[PDB]
C-alpha cells in the first residue's frame, strides 16, 4: 500500500525544488527526514512538511508501520506562474516569472 501527499502552488520554483528532492527519493522514510533537516536550501522546510504529511496519512488512514517505510516517488510538477514585470532602463520592462510548484512525495513499504 502507498500513501501520498501533495503541496499545490508552492511559490518555490520547480527547478529549485527538484535539487533537494533528488536527494531523498528511493531512501527510507527515517533518513529522508534527516536529509531535509540538514540541507540549507529554501525548499528543505517545505518538502519536509510534505513528507511529514504523507507519513501521517500512512499511519492514520492506511495503518501502515511508519518505522519501515520508503520514499517511492518524489517529484515536483509545474504550477501556474505569476507573471510580474520589471523596469530596467529607458522605459523598457522585462518579464519576471514567479514560478510555482506542485510538490508530491509518496511513501510505501513495498508490499501489496
Amino acid at each position: 500500500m502507498e500513501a501520498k501527499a501533495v503541496a499545490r502552488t508552492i511559490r518555490i520554483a520547480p527547478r529549485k525544488v527538484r535539487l533537494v528532492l533528488d536527494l531523498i527519493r528511493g531512501k527510507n522514510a527515517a533518513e529522508a527526514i534527516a536529509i531535509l533537516k540538514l540541507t540549507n536550501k529554501a525548499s528543505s522546510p517545505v518538502i519536509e512538511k510534505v513528507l511529514m504529511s504523507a507519513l501521517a496519512n500512512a499511519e492514520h488512514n492506511y495503518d501502515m508501520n511508519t518505522d519501515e517505510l520508503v520514499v517511492k516517488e518524489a517529484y515536483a510538477n509545474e504550477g501556474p506562474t505569476l507573471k510580474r514585470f520589471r523596469p530596467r532602463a529607458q522605459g523598457r520592462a522585462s518579464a519576471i516569472n514567479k514560478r510555482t510548484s506542485h510538490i508530491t512525495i509518496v511513501v510505501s513499504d513495498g508490499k501489496e
Binding site: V20, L23, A34, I35, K41
Partner: peptide, 15 residues
C-alpha cells in the same frame, strides 16, 4: 547537490 554530514548525536536527539 550533495548529501550532508548526518552523524548521530549519541547523548540524545536526531542526526
Amino acid at each position: 547537490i550533495s548529501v550532508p554530514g548526518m552523524t548521530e548525536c549519541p547523548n540524545c536527539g536526531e542526526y
